[PDB]
Symmetry: C2
Subunit: 355 residues, 2 copies
């Protein structure tokens, strides 16, 4: 009986709330496909600062190194916002976990359920053409980490990429498109940036190994228009760290349902950190209304990309698809009639049992 070790870092605010549902779902589907989890809980972020004085402790970091994946909640809150900037929960948890496990690829899905057309800020006619996009963002390179300097009269940052960096994120994009609708858009600014011309060179060469995939190119400025005017053309969108950061946020916006958005941050060895894309939501941390679907979908991405448990993952995604299409939703999705956090989780679990 194969056992998967998960480091569960629920974090702050709604984190521990939504996590409870994700673990309920994981424990069930584990048992249904006859594998087991060792779900190992540790403090991260605000909770860790209150306990150990640091957002990320050595004991938590060691647990992560001993695990196969990190299932991650949300970190941050007003209690901890008077700390110096570099010690705040968000900054001091995630950046070091990414560097330390070499999490260079960030995968952000944007698939708008037919049920939730109305929640998008785009007119329904644009959304009805069908929106199912995977943003693949290079996560540890580029301008955020290049040589920088802050002067009294002059300051600079450097957008630097190596071939190796570009290749490894490009492959994950091509691998993804191969089992989706066979299309990658590379988003860059190749009309003016040297780094972008390299991107094109290295990605055109990776594309030669993937004859099933149609590779297209689009400047970041045109992409920003396109995500609003006609997002149905995208399948997989491959972006640098900065352009992906900007455009995954725009995607989150046209999607409409923040509580549904998931995220995977992966290395090249099957290891990943999986989390809701939305933050800690302190406004509602004291209530029982947080949408747990993001976190649950994150757990499904975990199942796929780290444990190669594709049926388990697909069950969980189907069950959320069905629950929504039956009108069973949390407050952020339907203001007038809604389930509480634990009822939604229970609804999903109920749905999974019938199969």
């Amino acid at each position: 009986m194969k056992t998967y070790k998960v480091a569960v870092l629920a974090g702050d605010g709604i984190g521990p709330l939504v996590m409870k549902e994700a673990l309920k779902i994981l424990t069930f589907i584990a048992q249904k496909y006859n594998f087991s989890f060792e779900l190992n809980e540790a403090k991260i972020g605000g909770a860790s600062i209150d306990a150990y004085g640091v957002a990320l402790s050595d004991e938590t970091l060691k647990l992560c190194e001993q695990s196969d994946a990190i299932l991650f909640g949300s970190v941050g809150g007003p209690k901890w916002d008077n700390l110096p900037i570099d010690q705040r929960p968000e900054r001091a948890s995630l950046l070091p976990l990414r560097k330390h496990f070499n999490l260079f690829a960030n995968l952000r899905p944007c698939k708008i359920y037919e049920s939730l057309t109305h929640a998008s800020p785009l007119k329904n006619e644009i959304i009805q053409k069908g929106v199912d996009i995977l943003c693949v963002r290079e996560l540890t390179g580029g301008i955020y980490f290049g040589k920088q300097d802050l002067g009294k009269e002059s300051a600079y940052d450097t957008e630097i990429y190596t071939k190796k960096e570009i290749e490894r994120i490009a492959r994950i994009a091509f691998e993804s498109a191969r089992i989706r609708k066979k299309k990658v858009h590379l988003i860059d600014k190749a009309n003016v940036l040297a780094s972008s011309i390299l991107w094109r060179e290295v990605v055109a060469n990776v594309a030669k190994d993937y004859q099933d995939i149609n590779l297209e190119y689009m400047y970041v400025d045109n992409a920003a228009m396109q995500i609003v005017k006609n997002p149905s053309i995208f399948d997989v969108m491959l972006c640098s760290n900065l352009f992906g950061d900007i455009l995954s946020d725009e995607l989150a916006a046209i999607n409409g349902s923040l509580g549904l958005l998931s995220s995977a941050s992966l290395n090249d060895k099957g290891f990943g950190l999986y989390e809701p894309a939305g933050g800690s939501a302190p406004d509602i941390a004291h209530l029982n209304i947080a949408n747990p679907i993001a976190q649950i979908l994150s757990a499904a991405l975990m199942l796929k990309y780290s444990f190669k448990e594709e049926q388990a993952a697909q069950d969980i995604e189907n069950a959320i698809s069905l629950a929504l299409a039956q009108g069973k939703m949390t407050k952020d999705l339907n203001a007038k009639s809604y389930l509480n956090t634990d009822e939604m989780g229970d609804c999903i679990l109920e749905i999974l049992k019938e199969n």
Copy 2:
């Protein structure tokens, strides 16, 4: 009788078509407020390549240096796309005119007429909160012009800004907000970029001279969400070259009516290049349906920012406001019933005479 010298560079495709209307409007309002134009036509872009072998000639550059403003159409087209990249009409016309007259400030309005709510890709409810935004983009600095290198295995570009660069674009933003709704958002990425931290420093210090103005800060990624979810909060948005480039395009997209969008590119001495924000539109260059309003609005911006003819400008903007609200529109605005390019111009001119 004061005379204003204009260099008219109509360019390619629909350029010379829409320009004809703008000159009809300019000649009239000139005469109504008892000043005169010397409207001096020269070739730029495709037309200039066909005539002189270069997109920008010395004779055209000299005309521009002898003028008070450049009224500019659109450049580019498929005929000229087999030229080496650096010689193509767009690249070889505008970048050198900007460098040469030090056009560091790009002003792009995004004001959605009540008439044209429907044309926006955002749901009407979001647009009805009222969208009236001026994007002020630094135009000659930043990563597009910093130190760069293209290697076999490694490539880089440098986002560099000086205090002087930041101050001069910040002032134009503050001056603009002072006669609008008293709000500037600085858009940056100050959580990770040194250049962005300078931006904040220099702009907070410029803001001290403008106690009427509320200065707010927002990261470029949040702005991209905000332009889709709730664009009504923006008044003046101040951006670096790259962030402004991306976000002016997103604004153009939520606006919905490309043929209405204008652009001013200014130095600190009252000199500017004024143009429709949209390109040369080769698909329709051979027809009589191009929307001339962008170009006409560009001429109004010219009147304001270069000639301090505010009443003249306001007449022209009012006349377009009224024409649209009376349903008088070109094809791109109303597919079923529409005016031709010259009727639209005539309609606008007709409207101006009544006042």
